[PDB]
Amino acid sequence: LDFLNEYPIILLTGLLFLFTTIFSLICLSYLGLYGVFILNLASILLFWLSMLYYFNLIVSENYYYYISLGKWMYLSNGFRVSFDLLIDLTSISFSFLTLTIGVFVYIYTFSYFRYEPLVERLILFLNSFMISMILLVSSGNFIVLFLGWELIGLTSFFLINFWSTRVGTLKAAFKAFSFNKLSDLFLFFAILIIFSTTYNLDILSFNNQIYLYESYNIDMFYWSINLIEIISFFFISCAFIKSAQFGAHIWLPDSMEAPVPASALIHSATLVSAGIYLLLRLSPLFELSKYAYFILPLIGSVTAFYGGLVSAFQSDTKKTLAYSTISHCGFLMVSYSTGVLEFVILYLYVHGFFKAATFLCVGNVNRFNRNIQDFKRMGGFYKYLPFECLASFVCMINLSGLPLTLGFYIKHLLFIGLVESYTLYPLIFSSLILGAIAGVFYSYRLFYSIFFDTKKGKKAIYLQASRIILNSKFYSNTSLASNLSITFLVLISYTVILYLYCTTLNNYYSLSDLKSIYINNAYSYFYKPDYNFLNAVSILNWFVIILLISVIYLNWRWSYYYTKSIDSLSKFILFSFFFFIFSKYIL
Amino acid sequence: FQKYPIPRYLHVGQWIVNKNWKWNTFHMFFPTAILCFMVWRNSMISTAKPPNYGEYVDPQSPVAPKAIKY
Amino acid sequence: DAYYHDDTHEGLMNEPHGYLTMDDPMDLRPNYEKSALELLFLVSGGAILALMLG
Amino acid sequence: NMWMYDQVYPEYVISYNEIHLVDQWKGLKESFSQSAYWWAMMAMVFGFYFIN
Amino acid sequence: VVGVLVYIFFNSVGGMIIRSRIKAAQPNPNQVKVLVMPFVALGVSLVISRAGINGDDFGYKG
Amino acid sequence: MQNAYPEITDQHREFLKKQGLKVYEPKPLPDQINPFSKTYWITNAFIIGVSFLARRHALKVGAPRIFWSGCIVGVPLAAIISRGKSDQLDELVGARK
Amino acid sequence: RQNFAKNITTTDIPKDSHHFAAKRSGFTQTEQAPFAYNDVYQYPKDYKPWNYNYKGNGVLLALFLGSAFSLVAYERSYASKTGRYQRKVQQNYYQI
Amino acid sequence: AAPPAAFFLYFFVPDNFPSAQSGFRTASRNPFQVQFVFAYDNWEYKYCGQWWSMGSLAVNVLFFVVPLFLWLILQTQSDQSSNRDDNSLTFYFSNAGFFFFQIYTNTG
Amino acid sequence: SKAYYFVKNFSWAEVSNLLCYGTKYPTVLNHQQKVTRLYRATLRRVYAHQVEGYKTDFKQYNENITDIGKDFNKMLALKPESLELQAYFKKYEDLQEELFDPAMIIDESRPYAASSGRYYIFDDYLLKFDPFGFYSPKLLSENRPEEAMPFYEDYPQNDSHWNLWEQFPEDFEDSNAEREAILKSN
Amino acid sequence: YAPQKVVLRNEKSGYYANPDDVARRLIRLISLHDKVQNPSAITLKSTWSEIGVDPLSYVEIMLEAENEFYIELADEDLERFRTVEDAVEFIARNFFTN
Ligand SMILES: COC1=C(OC)C(=O)C(C/C=C(\C)CC/C=C(/C)CC/C=C(\C)CC/C=C(/C)CC/C=C(\C)CC/C=C(\C)CC/C=C(\C)CC/C=C(\C)CC/C=C(/C)CCC=C(C)C)=C(C)C1=O
Ligand SMILES: CCCCCCCCCCCCCCCCCC(=O)OC[C@H](COP(=O)([O-])OCC[N+](C)(C)C)OC(=O)CCCCCCCCCCCCCCCCC
């Protein structure tokens, strides 16, 4: 209907979600467990349906909305700011991912914390965090952006430190609190500089008149610093702290004692993506900045390598996922440094969806293992959590970027557009290559050690989960709702990623305008690649193949199948050679 | 965790189930929807939108962007 | 799960309980602090509504 | 305020899991000594890609 | 002053249950008065102030 | 104020409309969103009536009723804002005074 | 210390006497004398300690009347500001 | 360590009216906790010049010379403002003593 | 056993002592106590690395535990002042250090575990507390006066003191009926 | 549902696990050891030296005991065990015993 296209209902449904969350928080005695669950489920489902309707219009067609709620605050003599929301491609790209992951995490969170005394508090905290993140990405001016920035930091401080009776979790939450205070300082100083320069806080206007101030300088006490350089420096600093780049990443692994739905939301999109959003929100500023040009690829590649290698050595499942998230944040920073804004969105969506699904599977495994998150005390879990095993296999083969999967394409697109003109290019490229191959190691380690190793766990788990009296059609080591949530999340992820791939990677370009005038020749090597580039990518392909052979055929222990393992490796090599000969030359 | 007793005098929220939660859910949901509808109806007055497909902005029209006469 | 117990059978499942405020429901004192603070709120809201909005 | 005070399980404000390294200087020494391996592997990868 | 005195002296008779019992024992006109007339006094004060700040006697209308 | 954009000719816009293009024009508010229309106040009266009845039912059944009360004050409290900001002469992207 | 009287005159305190019965007979040579009053408080059985037990309409009516007065006063002020006896309603309204 | 035997406690003025909120139930205090509560207030230096080297001499000196550093930085940025014709660090006098929103009326 | 290895500002020597022996001060233990504690710590570490490990080999684990058992049986029969016993102590403390993991798995039953103290348990003092009488009956007398004590009202939970004078119903008849009756009588 | 009245904590028998089950499992585990001669002489009142359990085999058995009972025992607690009864009571009174 044309009325829906002219007047969005996203605002109405989001307000319904927010007000239901707040009133459930205040009137929690009237609503029991079931009442809170049902009310917030209805609100979140309506919000998701409305945003799903508008997703196609905003992404494919050139639809966007500027909504003003009213004049809000006086910030200068004779100056007032209003509460503005900008529902455009950049905002909807983050908001739809956050809302979908949040809907499925919400349904999963009731099965998780099944008999805990404070399920309602966790549900409402997750709702508050999602609302804050959605408000952050839908900002219309800088004041609303700062409000969302401070809200995501505050609500994540409560999802962390959920076990408020322990000071040990209080320390972990306070670490992130301090890092968020530093982020807020940097962002607010950058906003102050912007307002002192242009005397406006509207983002859109800022994106269209900042090029007029490229040749300007500011006078620090003994320095004359370019305006774009200092503004970009502060924005990049706060983005680095939120996105947990190297050095400022130490708060993120210590954030893992939060409940696993909170980890699924925080580490997949939302918080870790917030910094990336900033880079996408203010693209011209960083296009005109020398500091960004030098610092994004170097720090991104170092972070990618560091996170990828540290992840492959972890034994805690949540720590492995957290370090994988750090590596992927570095990869996203490099992808933004590429200069192609579509590749960033594709990487964001793929990583967020599959990382959230992997967190859900890991959370079910951890609940089965009775709060022991180290897979040194696991093994042979396939017969007790079969759905977890199979769904986890799918999610890890997609997340690790294995060949012939959806996650392969984002890595390939990243390596297509990499700029070779950097002074520190050798280090950047080596770090990127070493971080790209690390996914197979931690994916294989996690899957094999949790599900298909020897029994390393305690006898109580296995023996109590296998008594004869428990044989029934109702037998299960998880909940049906968890299985349905994971299944539907995977299906929706596949559908959305395929739709985005069609929109961006087809011969007919269909994506809406990204409001950026910096265009490079990166798509050429995607559209008309040449021979040396194909050979160069084949090199990394064969490196990954060698690593897969290593993780499959290496015997680190004595076994009755050692000799037969060597024989099978020899048979596979000979068969591959003969198969290649037959497929290439004769018939 | 195994359930443990909670003192009656404390207004805390451990293991609470309200038997009348359906009516309370109804009476918290529908007025919330009405309030949000009123807020959205007020906010649509101040909502902007780019021109639709097949439409162009006449630069000399009053709706077109303007400069300032000094 | 295997041995789940419903809310009626569960003797440690709570219903809404607890005193909202430290104030005694059957206090026999002519206390007026609450009335004074409600006067503050209501008169401030009325002054906003009848003097300042439009 | 160097301790998180608690009537049950009071803690130090900072945890040190890698206490086998006694101080930060030996930690830095160990970190560089072990990161030389990663430096060598990165050098080999870049040499391969620069040749080919 | 009349409104605030009547509000305080009508709502400061005891705890919630005691106040409920007293109001229930009150006859209908008494309950109507103790509800309405403080609101009447305060609202009339606010209305007088609003009439004070608005100039609606100006004769250049039309 | 000025035009701020380069000039265009009448022949060119005649050619444009011959080609099938249409000149962008702000649209009037629909009846539901118009705070001065009759359907707006019919909806407001319906809201007030249903809110009063549902408040009575909630009091009878024991559900919270403060939210039904916020709908009753919300109607006249939002009529001021909707009509108040339409009177102001400030210009957003919507239309030119 | 508190010095107010507890035997109020406005109403009778809700109480019951079946609880805590006195002995009054069959005493031994070593036990203490029984207590005298033994009455205990009785709650209205519809009281919820966890929420306001408010069933009135005065607050809602007062707030609604204040908001309606605000609306009509704004209408009068706007009519006076434009130099008119009443608001002149345009035939079409547009987005701000 | 043995619990302290002599330490500074809480004290109240003569004829003080006690606080009797929530039933007026007061517990016995912990000697170590009370000792910590009153230790800092009664702590004092032992000899002249002990402060300078107490902790870190360089850090203490830097803390001592902070106001001079702030004054010098302000002077440098005032130099920067002077040549750019920026707002100087002066008591501006442009309203001729007329206050911000002040009623200026006459009688008679 | 309290697992506060890293949440207290310990040095490595204290942590090593706590890992090898159940105390920070192993000098106050007997010879047999020290030998048994070191044997238990060594077996625990070997189990944590060779049974609950990464690529666990049961045959190698059995060989190593057999050798360790032989060595500790030799250790037990030695004398405390012998240098060979000191060498054995040094060797197995070095073994404990060499297998040290900053990511030790801590059993959930230990006092300072990851999931310890997640819930506040209310004792009988809080369960039986009811100042106002909604859940437990409350006397209008507010207490039972014990002998050898005067009868005094309990201290209220809220000592506001923002009270008026005593309130009376309107047109309250409060004449001196007794005095009037007696004066009429005479 | 909670009765909406003051209910105190219930201590019941003070055992979080079945004492007979704990004792039988522990005695079977003890009999699994090589240096234990006969399982038929083991009793709750039996001392570790009577059944032939020297301190090294004692720590060996008590490690597998804590593995089997899903708990972990401190050095002092194990040092205070004189007979099978002491260990059985300590394990059965543990809140974490499975
Ligand atoms: C493996 O990481 C590391 C981490 O994890 C990221 C760590 O946490 C830590 C621990 C750190 C701390 C505790 C705090 C310290 C703080 C830091 C910021 C330290 C961080 C250290 C790093 C990120 C490691 C980077 C350092 C090195 C030495 C990497 C070594 C890389 C190579 C050897 C690549 C090989 C490059 C070659 C061979 C260049 C030769 C040139 C040609 C063949 C010509 C072609 C090239 C050009 C035409 C252009 C290039 C020319 C130049 C001059 C640029 C070359 C400069 C380079 C640096 C390559 C350490 C020590 C670390 O170590
Ligand atoms: C010019 C080329 C230079 C190449 C330099 C060397 C590169 C080596 C591969 C990348 C670094 C991998 C570091 C280890 C990551 C995993 C760590 C881990 O947890 O391991 C346990 C995993 C899983 O085992 P597990 O965890 O079950 O337990 C095994 C037992 N422990 C714990 C003791 C290891 O095992 C492995 O990773 C097996 C060893 C992998 C060895 C790979 C050898 C590669 C040889 C070079 C191939 C070159 C091909 C051509 C390339 C051309 C382009 C450059």
Q: End-to-end CA distance of chain J: give it in Å, rounded.
A: 27
Phi, psi (deg, nearest 5) at residue A69? -85, -20
Phi, psi (deg, nearest 5) at residue C10? -70, 115
H23: left (phi over 0), alpha (psi -120 to 50) or beta: left
Beta carbons within 8 Å of A565's beta carbon, 6+ residues apart: A553, A555, A559
Q: How many CB atoms lie within 10 A of CB I180?
A: 10
The amino acid at residue A188 is F
Contact, J70 vs J97, CB < 8 A? yes
Give Rg (Cα) of chain C: 22
Contact, I121 vs B2, CB < 8 A? no
- Residue I22 sits at the vertex; the CA angle it makes with I55 and I30, to the nearest 5 degrees, is 120
* Cα–Cα distance list, A34 to A293, B24, C23, G51, G61 (Å): 52, 11, 30, 20, 33
Contact, A200 vs A152, CB < 8 A? no
Cα–Cα distance for residue pair B41/F32, rounded to 1 Å: 8
Q: How many CB atoms lie within 10 A of CB A268?
A: 28
Give Rg (Cα) of chain H: 28
In sequence order, the β-bridge partners of residue A139 are A85
Beta carbons within 8 Å of A432's beta carbon, 6+ residues apart: A301, A304, A305, A331, A334, A414, A415, A418
Q: End-to-end CA distance of chain F: give it in Å, rounded.
A: 12
Contact: C18, B18; criterion CB under 8 Å: no
Helix (H, G, I), strand (E, B) or coil at B67: coil
Cα–Cα distance for residue pair B33/A20, rounded to 1 Å: 9
The runs of H, that is alpha helices, within chain G are 58-81
The ligand placed nearest to the CA atom of residue A330 is 1
Distance of CA I82 to the CA centre of its chain: 40
- Which tokens is A421 given? 């003109």
Binding site per annotation, positions of I: 2, 4, 24
Please name the residue of chain H whose CA is at the shortest distance from the CA of residue I153: H23
- Which tokens is A575 given? 């068969």
Contact: A29, C1; criterion CB under 8 Å: no
Contact, I64 vs I57, CB < 8 A? no
- Which tokens is H27 given? 């517990």
Q: How many CB atoms lie within 10 A of CB A582?
A: 10
Contact, B20 vs A27, CB < 8 A? no
Beta carbons within 8 Å of F70's beta carbon, 6+ residues apart: B31, B35
Contact, A117 vs A92, CB < 8 A? no
- Which tokens is H65 given? 């010379």
Task: Tell me the DSSP string of A402-466.
Answer: -TTSHHHHHHHHHHHS-----TTHHHHHHHHHHHHTHHHHHHHHHHHHHHSS---S-HHHHHHTT
- Which tokens is D26 given? 């030996």
Q: Which residue has the tokens 């103790």?
A: E34
Helix (H, G, I), strand (E, B) or coil at A139: strand
I50-53: Cβ within 8 A, 24+ apart: I51/A456, I52/A376, I52/A377, I52/A456, I52/A457, I52/I105, I53/A376, I53/A456
Active-site residue among J20, J21, J34, J54? Answer: J54
The pairing of beta strand B55-56 with beta strand F22-23: parallel
G38: left (phi over 0), alpha (psi -120 to 50) or beta: left
Binding site per annotation, positions of I for ADP: 2, 4, 24
Contact, J6 vs I130, CB < 8 A? yes
Resolution, expressed in angstroms to one decimal: 2.6
Cα–Cα distance for residue pair A260/A485, rounded to 1 Å: 15
- Which tokens is G84 given? 């008119």
What stretches of A130-284 adopt beta strand conformation (E)?
A: 217-220, 223-226
Cα–Cα distance for residue pair A328/A298, rounded to 1 Å: 14
The amino acid at residue I73 is N
The burial of G5, by beta-carbon neighbours within 10 Å (0-12 exposed, 13-18 middle, 19 or more buried), is given as exposed
The runs of H, that is alpha helices, within A244-340 are 260-267, 271-281, 283-287, 290-311, 317-338
A439: left (phi over 0), alpha (psi -120 to 50) or beta: alpha
Contact, C53 vs E46, CB < 8 A? no
Ligand 2 site, residue A429, Cβ cutoff 6 A: no
* Ligand 1 surroundings by CB, under 6 angstroms: A 246, 302, 306, 423-427, 430; D 31-32, 35, 38-39, 42-43, 46, 50
Is J54 among the catalytic positions?
Answer: yes
Beta carbons within 8 Å of B42's beta carbon, 6+ residues apart: F35, F78, F81, F82
Cα–Cα distance for residue pair G54/G32, rounded to 1 Å: 45
Contact, I143 vs I154, CB < 8 A? yes
The amino acid at residue A223 is W
- Residue A565 sits at the vertex; the CA angle it makes with A562 and A571, to the nearest 5 degrees, is 150
Contact, B43 vs A65, CB < 8 A? no
CA-based nearest residue to A313, from A328, A324, A325: A324
Cα–Cα distance for residue pair G21/B37, rounded to 1 Å: 60
Phi, psi (deg, nearest 5) at residue A223? -135, 150
- Which tokens is B13 given? 């929220």
Cα D39 to ligand 1 centre (Å): 7
Q: Nearest C-alpha of chain G: how many angstroms from F61?
A: 12
Q: How many CB atoms lie within 10 A of CB D6?
A: 14
Contact, D20 vs I97, CB < 8 A? yes
Please name the residue of chain B whose CA is at the shortest distance from the CA of residue J4: B8
Ligand 2 site, residue A556, Cβ cutoff 6 A: yes
Cα–Cα distance for residue pair A122/A120, rounded to 1 Å: 5
- Which tokens is I53 given? 């490990």
Question: Reduced to 3 DSSP states, what percent helix, strand and coil does chain H have, rounded to the nearest 5?
Answer: 40, 0, 60
Helix (H, G, I), strand (E, B) or coil at A202: strand
Q: Nearest C-alpha of chain B: how many angstroms from A27?
A: 9
Cα–Cα distance for residue pair F93/B49, rounded to 1 Å: 8
Element spanning G15, H or E: strand G15-16
For residue D46, the ligand 1 atom closest to its alpha carbon is 35
- Which tokens is A356 given? 């959230």
Cα–Cα distance for residue pair A187/H92, rounded to 1 Å: 31
The burial of A460, by beta-carbon neighbours within 10 Å (0-12 exposed, 13-18 middle, 19 or more buried), is given as middle
Distance of CA H59 to the CA centre of its chain: 19
Q: Nearest C-alpha of chain B: how many angstroms from G8?
A: 27
For the CA atoms of I37, I38, I41, I45, the dihedral, rounded to the nearest 10 degrees, stands at: -170
Phi, psi (deg, nearest 5) at residue D12? -75, 145
Ligand 2 site, residue A411, Cβ cutoff 6 A: no
Quick one: three-class SS letters along A34-91? HHHHHHHHHHHHHHHHHHHHHHHHHHCCCCCEEEEEEEEEEEECCEEEEEEEEECHHH
Phi, psi (deg, nearest 5) at residue J11? -90, -20
Cα–Cα distance for residue pair A547/A438, rounded to 1 Å: 9
CA-based nearest residue to B44, from F48, F85, G72, A205: F85
For the CA atoms of F77, F83, F87, F91, the dihedral, rounded to the nearest 10 degrees, stands at: 100
- Which tokens is I147 given? 């002998």
Contact, A543 vs A536, CB < 8 A? no
Number of helices (H), then strands (E), in chain G:
1, 2
Cα–Cα distance for residue pair H16/I91, rounded to 1 Å: 67
The amino acid at residue B28 is M
CA-based nearest residue to A155, from A125, A181, A184, A124: A125
Q: Nearest C-alpha of chain A: how many angstroms from G53?
A: 13
Query: Cβ contacts (< 8 Å) between I43 and chain J: which residues?
Result: 59-60, 63
Contact, F5 vs B65, CB < 8 A? yes
The amino acid at residue D47 is G
Cα–Cα distance for residue pair A54/A93, rounded to 1 Å: 11
CA-based nearest residue to E43, from A310, G67, A264: G67
In sequence order, the β-bridge partners of residue G16 are G40
Helix (H, G, I), strand (E, B) or coil at F65: coil
Cα–Cα distance for residue pair I10/I22, rounded to 1 Å: 15
Cα–Cα distance for residue pair A268/A280, rounded to 1 Å: 17
Cα–Cα distance for residue pair I12/A484, rounded to 1 Å: 49
In sequence order, the β-bridge partners of residue J47 are J83
Please name the residue of chain F whose CA is at the shortest distance from the CA of residue A2: F30
Please name the residue of chain I whose CA is at the shortest distance from the CA of residue B5: I122
Q: Quick check: do E and F touch, 3+ CB pairs under 8 A?
A: no
Contact, I156 vs I145, CB < 8 A? no
Ligand 2 site, residue D43, Cβ cutoff 6 A: no
Q: How many CB atoms lie within 10 A of CB G37?
A: 12
- Residue A579 sits at the vertex; the CA angle it makes with A575 and A580, to the nearest 5 degrees, is 120
CA-based nearest residue to A131, from A25, A257, A279, A33: A25
* Cα–Cα distance list, G83 to A513, E59, G70, G88, H77 (Å): 48, 9, 20, 10, 54
Contact, A341 vs A514, CB < 8 A? yes
In sequence order, the β-bridge partners of residue B55 are F22
Experiment type: cryo-EM
CA-based nearest residue to B52, from A9, A208, A64: A64
Contact: B18, A35; criterion CB under 8 Å: yes
CA-based nearest residue to A32, from H4, D26, B13: B13
Cα–Cα distance for residue pair A456/A449, rounded to 1 Å: 9
CA-based nearest residue to J71, from J32, J16, J11, J24: J16
F28: left (phi over 0), alpha (psi -120 to 50) or beta: beta
Helix (H, G, I), strand (E, B) or coil at B22: helix
In sequence order, the β-bridge partners of residue A73 are A81
Phi, psi (deg, nearest 5) at residue J47? -85, 150
- Which tokens is G52 given? 């306001």
Cα–Cα distance for residue pair A420/A425, rounded to 1 Å: 6
Contact, I170 vs J40, CB < 8 A? no
Quick one: three-class SS letters along chain I? CCCCCCCCCCCHHHHHHHHHCCCCCHHHCCHHHHHHHHHHHHHHHHHHHHCCCCCCCHHHHHHHHHHHHHHHHHHHCCCCCCHHHHHHHHHHHHHHHHCCCCCCCCCCCCCCCCCCCCCCCCCHHHHCCCCCCCCCCCECCCCCCCCCCCCCCCCCCCCCCCECCCCCCCCCCCCCHHHHHHHHHC
- Residue A277 sits at the vertex; the CA angle it makes with A274 and A281, to the nearest 5 degrees, is 140
Contact, A188 vs A196, CB < 8 A? no
Cα–Cα distance for residue pair H62/H57, rounded to 1 Å: 9
Crossing angle of helices G58-81/E28-53, nearest 10°? 20
Give C 11-40 residues with CB within 8 A of chain I.
17, 19, 22-27, 29-33, 36
- Which tokens is I63 given? 């060989």
For chain F, give the number of residues.
Answer: 97
Distance of CA A553 to the CA centre of its chain: 32
Contact, H78 vs H89, CB < 8 A? yes
Give F 72-91 residues with CB within 8 A of chain C.
80, 84
DSSP F27: P
Contact, B21 vs A35, CB < 8 A? yes
Beta carbons within 8 Å of J92's beta carbon, 6+ residues apart: J15, J16, J17, J18, J19, J22
B38 and chain A: CB distance < 8 Å anywhere?
no
Helix (H, G, I), strand (E, B) or coil at H72: helix
* Cα–Cα distance list, A231 to A191, A195, A218, A243 (Å): 8, 11, 11, 18
